[PDB]
């Protein structure tokens, strides 16, 4: 009906936005070790 009772409210809402970021890195920041490769045969959907 529109009769305002003796009570108040506070609302909360959460949104999200896609943004563009920016990265900076030093010279000697990470050490990288790469390995070797291994093959695996397996029955595929039609072949291997």
């Amino acid at each position: 009906t529109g009769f305002h009772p003796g009570i108040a409210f506070t609302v909360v809402r959460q949104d999200r936005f896609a943004t563009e970021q920016l990265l900076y890195a030093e010279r000697a920041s990470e050490s990288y070790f790469v390995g070797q490769i291994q093959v695996h045969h397996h029955d595929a959907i039609g072949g291997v």
């Binding site: 029955d43 959907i45 039609g46 072949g47």
Partner: protein, 357 residues
């Protein structure tokens, strides 16, 4: 890696000439067993020979009608899935696809004694589900067609038994590989009705929905493709078929005081009947009343008169995120919508699970 099965048969229900390579082919049991089972399982009150009337006319409109009774090995053994799909096309939900396949199978075949054959088969199934002779024990399964050779009205076909679909060599087509092809009328995936993710491995089933009423019975044939478990498929199907289940529970059978056992056993001072009189000397005055119960239960829905479906595992698809393709191509002289399944491994024993709830 795969195995093959050969069999010769009459070509009145199957035509390996027009049927595409990779379609499903089923076989039938001897019709002489139907009557031996019907006259002993027919519900009380119903006429048991209406099936015989419906069956005799089937072979009366079929070539070599004087070759029934001996089973020498020259009967109409195998049949196609599209044949039953066209015979019962008036019951599938996809109106246009059903009737298109029907006219296509009528035209591509002899088209002279084909319409009569179809209606005979139609009421044949209708009378099959009239005396509880449900056609899920007489229709087996063969693999997809691989090779065939025919000279006239008699064909020798070979199909895969179990294993990968594209592991064979048809060796006479353009390519040496084939994929499963089905009419778009029978295809019905349940997960997209049940609203769950469709990723990973999925099983294949065939279902036989039954409707039982007075002079109005129906039987479809659906090839379901779902990721649901081996036995959980039964609980899943009931949620979608809850209507027909309740219809059958009330229109399946159309042809008395309780007793307080626990009450009078919990309380003492009831007429006792000690073993001394059941020894067997005068066992009538000892059991004169002891109770009456006036009890009998004759007409009640059995678990066989309320059945509405029967499924069976056929094969799986190991490749996750299947990509079945639907398109329309020429089938003889007409175009029909077919769905193409790739990489499906056949297997599984022929055991039928009946959903009576």
């Amino acid at each position: 890696t795969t195995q093959l099965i050969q069999q010769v048969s009459l070509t009145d229900f199957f035509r390996p000439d027009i049927e595409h390579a990779g379609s499903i082919v089923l076989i039938l049991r001897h019709p002489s067993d139907m009557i031996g089972e019907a006259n002993t399982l027919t519900q009380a009150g119903r006429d048991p020979d209406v099936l015989l009337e419906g069956l005799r006319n089937l072979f009366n409109a079929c070539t070599a009608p004087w070759t029934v009774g001996e089973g020498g090995g020259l009967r109409a053994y195998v049949t196609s899935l599209s044949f039953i799909a066209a015979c019962r096309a008036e019951e599938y939900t996809d109106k246009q696809a059903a009737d298109a396949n029907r006219t296509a199978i009528v035209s591509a075949y002899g088209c002279s004694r084909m319409e009569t054959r179809l209606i005979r088969f139609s009421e044949c199934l209708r009378a099959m589900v009239q005396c509880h002779v449900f056609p899920h024990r007489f229709i087996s399964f063969f693999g997809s067609l691989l090779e065939y050779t025919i000279q006239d009205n008699l064909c020798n076909i070979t199909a895969v038994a179990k294993g990968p679909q594209e592991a064979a060599r048809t060796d006479k087509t353009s390519t040496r590989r084939v994929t499963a092809n089905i009419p778009a009328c029978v295809f019905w995936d349940v997960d997209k009705d049940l609203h769950l993710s469709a990723d990973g491995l999925k099983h294949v089933f065939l279902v036989f929905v039954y409707t039982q009423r007075r002079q109005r019975e129906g039987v479809r044939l659906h090839l379901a493709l779902s990721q649901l478990n081996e036995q959980c498929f039964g609980r899943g199907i009931g949620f979608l078929l809850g209507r027909i289940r309740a219809e059958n529970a009330a229109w399946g059978t159309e042809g008395t005081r309780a007793l307080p056992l626990v009450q009078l056993s919990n309380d003492p001072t009831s007429p006792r009947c000690s073993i001394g009189e059941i020894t067997g000397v005068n066992w009538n005055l000892a059991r004169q009343r002891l109770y009456q119960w006036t009890g009998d239960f004759r007409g009640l829905p059995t678990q066989l008169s309320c059945m509405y479906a029967a499924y069976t595992l056929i094969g799986t698809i190991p490749s996750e995120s299947v990509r079945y393709t639907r398109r329309m191509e020429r089938f003889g002289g007409y175009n029909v919508p077919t769905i193409w399944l790739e990489g499906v491994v056949w297997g599984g024993t022929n055991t039928w699970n009946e959903c009576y709830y």
